[PDB]
Hints:
The complex is a heterooctamer, with 4 copies of chain A and 4 copies of chain E.
Chain A: E1 8-10
Chain E: E1 4-6, E2 11-15, E3 19-24, E4 32-40, E5 48-54, E6 64-71, E7 84-90, E8 96-102, E9 108-113, H1 121-133, H2 135-165, H3 171-189, H4 193-206, H5 208-215
Antiparallel strand pairs in E: 2-3, 2-5, 4-7, 5-6, 7-8, 8-9
Amino acid sequence: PRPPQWAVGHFM
Amino acid sequence: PPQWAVGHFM
Amino acid sequence: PPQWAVGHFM
Amino acid sequence: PRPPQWAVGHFM
Amino acid sequence: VLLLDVTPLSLGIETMGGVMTTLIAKNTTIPTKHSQVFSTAEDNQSAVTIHVLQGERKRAADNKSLGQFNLDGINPAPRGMPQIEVTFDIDADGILHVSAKDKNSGKEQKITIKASSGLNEDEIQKMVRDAEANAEADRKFEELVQTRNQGDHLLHSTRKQVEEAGDKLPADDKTAIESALTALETALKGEDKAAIEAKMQELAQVSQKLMEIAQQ
Amino acid sequence: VLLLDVTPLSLGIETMGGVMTTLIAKNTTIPTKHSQVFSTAEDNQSAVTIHVLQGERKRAADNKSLGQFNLDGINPAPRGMPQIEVTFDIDADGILHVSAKDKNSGKEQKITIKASSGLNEDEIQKMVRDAEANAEADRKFEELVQTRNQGDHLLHSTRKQVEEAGDKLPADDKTAIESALTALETALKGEDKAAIEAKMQELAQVSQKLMEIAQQQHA
Amino acid sequence: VLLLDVTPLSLGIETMGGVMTTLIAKNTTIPTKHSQVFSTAEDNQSAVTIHVLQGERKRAADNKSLGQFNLDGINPAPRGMPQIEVTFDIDADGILHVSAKDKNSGKEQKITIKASSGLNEDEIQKMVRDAEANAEADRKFEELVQTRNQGDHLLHSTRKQVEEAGDKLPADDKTAIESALTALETALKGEDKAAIEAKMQELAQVSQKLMEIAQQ
Amino acid sequence: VLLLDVTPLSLGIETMGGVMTTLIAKNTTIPTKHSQVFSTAEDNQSAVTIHVLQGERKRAADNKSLGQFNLDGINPAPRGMPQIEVTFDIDADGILHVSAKDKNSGKEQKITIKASSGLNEDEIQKMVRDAEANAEADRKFEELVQTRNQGDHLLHSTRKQVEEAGDKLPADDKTAIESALTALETALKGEDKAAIEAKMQELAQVSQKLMEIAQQQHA
C-alpha cells in the first residue's frame, strides 16, 4: 500500500 | 453547562 | 358483455 | 433432470 | 461508463382479473427487450386489449396506464389456447415499443410510447412507498385473482365435460353439478378467497361420476 | 424487540419438471403460515409426492432437501384437476409443519421438520452467492420448464380434441394436426426452448378447423 | 437451520451533535459483538453519557432510546484524546450488553438491555418507512453535524495556538482572530451549514500569521 | 419518464492510507452535485493530489482510476487544518466535473471526465460481485487504515505536547512517554491493528501528567 506524494486527509 | 457528549477518537 | 382480457397461455 | 413417480403440478 | 439508463419502475400489461403482470422488472438496464406468450381469457374470444402499465402495485387500476391497443382477428379456440406473444422493447433512446402477435393468424399490432411518458421522479418515489405500505393488501388481491382464475378454469372445463358426457351423466348428477357450477360462478364475482375455495371444493364433491365418465 | 426470527432462505416444494416453487419467501418473520393449492401432473395420478426444499435455486436438485411424504388416494381425474392444498406452517420455535390435504377425498398427510434442519449459516451464504452467480442459467432453466409444461398441455388437449371431433375433422386437417403433434412431442423431449415454441406455433397454425369444431360442439 | 435471529433495526449510541452512530448494522445475525473507540467532545471532560439507540434515523431524538449510563473518572486531556471503548454484545438469547471502558483509567461501566426492549413489529415498519421518507432531511442533519464538529475542532485548535503563540502574535491579529473565533462560535450554535462554512473560511483568512508562528 | 440516468458505481477520491472515500453514492439519479471539505495529510503540505475513483472497493488500488490533478499553493499550516473543498458534479449528459478549491488561498483546479470513462457493464457486474466477495477483507483494510490514522494523530499531537510542556514534564514521565511513543511509531508501521491499539493504550496510560500540564497551560 504505497503513499502518493500529496495525500488528501480528513479536515479536522 | 457540563458536557456529557461522546465524540470521535482522533 | 364482450371480453378483452389477456390470460395465461396454458 | 429425472422425474419423480408422482410429480406435483399446477392446479388449473 | 459513469451512468446507466435504468427503468425506475416495473413495466407490464394488465392480465385476467385486473392485475399487473410485469414484463420488464424495475431497475433493468436499457436497451432491453422481453417477450412472453399470453392468451385469451374466454372461449372463442376474437380480440385482446393490451393495456400497458407502469408501477409496483398488483391492481392494474393502482398503476400508471401508459396506453392500450387491441389485437383482433383471433380465431375461435378454448380459453388459453391461442398464443399471443407480447414484446416490450425499449431502444437506446428510452422509447418503449409494445407489440402483440398472434402466432396462429400471424396478425400483429403495436404502439410506441415516448421516453417522457409515465410518472415523474416525485411520483416514482410515492409509487415505491405506496407499494411498500400496501404490500399485504396487494399480495391478497393477487392471490384472490389467482384463485378466481383457477375457479374460472374449473368452472369451464367442468361445463365442457358435462357437455361431452351427455346422456351418460345421470339426471341427479346433471342437476347437482349445474347447481354447484352456478354457485361457483356467483362466488367468482365476489371478493372472498375462502368462499371461492369452498365452492370449488363443493363442485369437486358432486363431480365424482363426471370424472369417471370423463376418464373414458 | 431487539431481534426477530426470520427465514434465511426460501422454503417450498418440487413441482412439475424439477422446479422449486416457493411457499415461504426468504426473510419472512416467523411465526408464519402459507397455503397454496396444487394438483397432479398426470391423468389418473393417484398420489402426489411432497418434496420439501430450502434454498434460492430454481432447479429443485440444487436446493437443500428437507424431507418428503406422499399423499395417497386421489380419486381418478384429468391432470391438473384435483385440488391438493399444501400448507407450510413455521411456529414461534422455528419448527416447520408441512401438510397436504385433498379437498375432495378429505385425505391429509403431514410431516414435521426440526428447526436445526437444512443449511448452516455458511452454506446459507454460499447458496445466496451461488443463486446470484447462476441467475441467468437458473432463469433459462425455469423458462424451459414453463415452456415444456405449456407445450405438454397443448399437445394433450389437442389430442383430446381430435378424439372428440371424430369424423367431423376433415382428412387433410387430421393429417396436418397429426404431423404437428408428432413434431411437438419430439421437441418437448429436447432442451431447446425456441424449437418447442416453433412447434407449438406450427400446431396452432394447422388447428383452425379443429378449434372451429370444438366451438360448434360446446357452443 | 430454518430460521435466524437477526436485528430488525440498527443499534448504536448518540454522538456529538445529537446524531445516532451505529455499532450493530440492521439485519445482523446474533449472537454478535462489536467494539469501537470513541472519545470526549470537550477539553478535560471527566464523564461521558452512553445513550443507547435503536432505529434508522440520523437525529438521536427520532430513534428509540433504550436507556443510558455514565462513565466518569476520565482524566484531563484535550478533546478527542481519551480512548473510550464502547462494546455492544448481543448474546444467543437476544439480551444486549452495552459497556464502555476508558483504556487509560481502566474504569468501565455497563448496562444490560432485555430482548423485548425497543420497538414492536408495527413500530419497526413505521421506523423503516419514516427513515426512507426523511432520507434527505436526515442526510442534511448529519452533514450539518459533521461541519459543526469540524468548526468546533477548528475553533479550539485555533484558540490553543493563540495561547501558545502568546506575545509573538501581533495585537491586530490577536483581536481579528478572536473576533472571527467568536463569530464562528455563534454560527456553530445555529443550523445553517453554509453560514458555518463561511465563518470557518473567515477565520482561516485572519489566521495566516498565526499559522507561521505555529510552524515554529 | 420510463427510465432514469443513474450511477452504476460509487464515485470518489483517494484519501490518507490508500482508501476510497465516496462522494457520489452508487445509484444516484443524475444530474447530481456533492461537495465535501477535505484537508492535507502532513504538516506544511503545499499541494494535494485529487485522485478520482470509480467502484465499490475500499482499497483505492482496487477501484477504477478516472483521472487526477493537483491543487497547489496551500499556505503553510498543520496537517488537517487547511480547508480544501472537493466537488463532484455530474450533468444531465453524464459528464463528471471534479474540482478542488482552497477556501483560504482562493486557488482552484478542476478536470472534466467523459461519460464513456470507467468500467463497462460487464466490469460493473464483476466489481459488484468482487466487492461482495471481499467485504470482510475490505472492511478489515478500512479499519486498519482508520486505526493507523488515529494512532498517527495521537503520536504527533503527543510529541507536540511534550515539546510545549518543556521542563514542566517530570523526567520519569518524559521517559515513559518517550518509550510509549517509540513502541507506537513502530506498531503504526506494521499491519497489525490489535498491536496499534495496544500501543495507543500504553501511551494513554503513561500520559496522565503530560495531559494535566496541557490542561494548566491552556486553561
